[PDB]
Structures are given as structure tokens and as C-alpha cells.
């Protein structure tokens, strides 16, 4: 089976066509601008650009397609899926009262956030005054897949979560559906399942098989986890990037609105996680990468530095423990740059350690092993510190590209996420 993964991220889009019986693939890219008067046009043209750059052989052989997008990026469209106003991007917050959403979702549901799809739909509602029932709100991944299969008001329970969906009960609340916003809500499927065949005109134009299936997509954050291949509960993917992002697979859904912790449904399992303000950005504040490496070579993890740092890049922390007033803790600062670096890596290690423990304290399945992604994943000293402090096998994630995880999503769905 040959599947195509389309990933639309923060500043670009990547396509990965993958042949899974050959384990061979091709990857193409499109880079977004940093400003547009028409982001829908930018995204749609990116879609055709990605498809075009794929060789004719692969395109003829593609049987399934899936698309992941940025979580919280939504479009207000009419009956035909035509943008009626500018998209509200993932980073944009809305000046609405979250108390106006209380009757549509449970106590501290993930949708209760000024940046959620639901909050943006309510913002649009109070903007236009009254939204027509034949209109629809679409996530980025939704709208793009709509360009492929032509079926309107279709989404997945990953993107739809922050729209107010409850994947624990597999439904929107009856009060939300009965509401004035109800007619704009999409039909929610499981990521990976076939929505419908590709549009005949689209298939013919781009030399794709007319029998190719367009699946239900995901978020790019979840696609990244799917790229690792981890499917057993207790397994976790750690992203050692600018910020440390933890993703833990569990048999139980856990949530903590205080620390921004919530859970996505993933087949029969649950994907929980948390994001710290700490990360490699703190490291770059004192070292360039080259110097960072030359100094890491001289660090022996088997001996404590005596330093107890909390490596925030600035004031404020959100996970594992929430404290907006917490300041970075980088004292005492030794004269030896090597040992100061060790203190930093030890602090970042503690963040990850306390992060996974916090997740387990909330009820998540105990950590079995860790797959690592991001820039710090290649840092073996950092890996040793993480390993000896956490106590589980830690390795580098085989694949990390979101488009590849989405290609796997197209090829196999979420089938691996069940009891064997």
C-alpha cells in the first residue's frame, strides 16, 4: 500500500509519499510567507504545489491520503466551503467570556480556552451577530481535505476536541448541538478512516487514481507522535526542541487545566502530554550549537555537578508545575562553562522527569520507555542524564516528521492503538 501524508505546519507544508512494502519514500516541501491577506489561497496553492512536485509514478500509485494541520486554525465557510472571513489562526486569542461556553462542555474541557476552535466560533458568532445554519466552521486540515474529497462539514476527533467534542463519549454535547452554533459543527470521524473517494476532477488533473481515498486527518502535533511508531501504552515521545514537549500514551485519560494538561483519544488508548517553558532556547541563551557540542564532550553524567538549576528562558512556567511568577534559577554559576552546561542539562532533565511523573500522578499509565525527538535527542550526555534520572530505556525516535506520521495514518489508521 502506497499512502500520502500531507502536513501543514506553522511556517510551511511537507508532503511524504511512502511505499510501505518497499519502505521507500519521496518528500517535497513548500514554504509559507510570514504574512498574507489571503491565507486560504496560500494553503490551497501549497496543496497543489505539493501534489505537483511528487513524481508521476508515485502519484499514480497513491491509494490513500491524509492531512494534518495546525490545531486551532479555523475557517468560517459557507455551504460550498468558501471562506467568508479571514481564518482565525492557532496563536490568536479571542476576547470572549469563557463563561459563555460553560453550558456546552464539561467543567474544564480543553475547549475552554481563548485560543480554542470553539472560542473562535463563539467570537465569530458575536461578530456576525447571527451565523447562517448552512455555514460551517472548518479546521485547517478539514478545509484542505475538503479540497480533495468535496465532502463538507467533515472532521476528526483530534481537531474537533478543542471545538467542544468529547471523544470519551464520542459526541458533541446535546446543548451545543441544540445551540445556534450546532449547524456549523462538523460530522466527526476517527483519524485515518476513509471519508470518501478523491474528487474525479482532482484525480484526473494531478494524475491520481480516481479510486484514491481521502482519510480523516489529525493535528501536526499528533502526527509527530504517530511518526514515532509507538503504540503501546506507557510509551512516550519526548521533544527536546526550543521547548520540552512530552507526549505519553496511556490507557487512561488525564487532565489538569492548571498545567494545561489534557488527553487526545487515540484508538482504544489516550495520548496525554504537557509542554514546559524550559528547553533548548535556554541553552542557546548562553551557547551557540558548535560551542554547545564542544563543551558537551567534556561532561561526565555519572557525577552530579552540585548545581540545581531551573532553566526557564524567562519569567513564568506552565508545566510540570504552574507558576507564572517563577523566575529562572541559574545560580550559583561556576567559572567552568562545561559544568555550567551540565547544570543546565541536569535542570532540563529534571523538568522532563518531573513532567512524566506529574502525568503519572494524574492517572496516566506508568512510563515504560521514551522515544526522543528534537535537537537535544542527539545529545548523548543529556540522554544519559535523562536515562539515569527517569529509569526507563531512552532512544532516538526512528522518524519524527509529521508528514510521515500522517502517511502512516493514511496507510494504517489508528488500528495499532488497541489491545493485541
Numbering used by the authors: 2 to 421
Sentences from the paper on this structure:
Synpcc7942_2462 from the cyanobacteria Synechococcus elongatus PCC 7942 encodes a putative sugar kinase (SePSK), and this kinase contains 426 amino acids. The At2g21370 gene product from Arabidopsis thaliana, xylulose kinase-1 (AtXK-1), whose mature form contains 436 amino acids, is located in the chloroplast (ChloroP 1.1 Server). SePSK and AtXK-1 display a sequence identity of 44.9%, and belong to the ribulokinase-like carbohydrate kinases, a sub-family of FGGY family carbohydrate kinases. Domain I exhibits a ribonuclease H-like folding pattern, and is responsible for the substrate binding, while domain II possesses an actin-like ATPase domain that binds cofactor ATP.
To identify the function of these three residues of SePSK, we constructed D8A, T11A and D221A mutants.
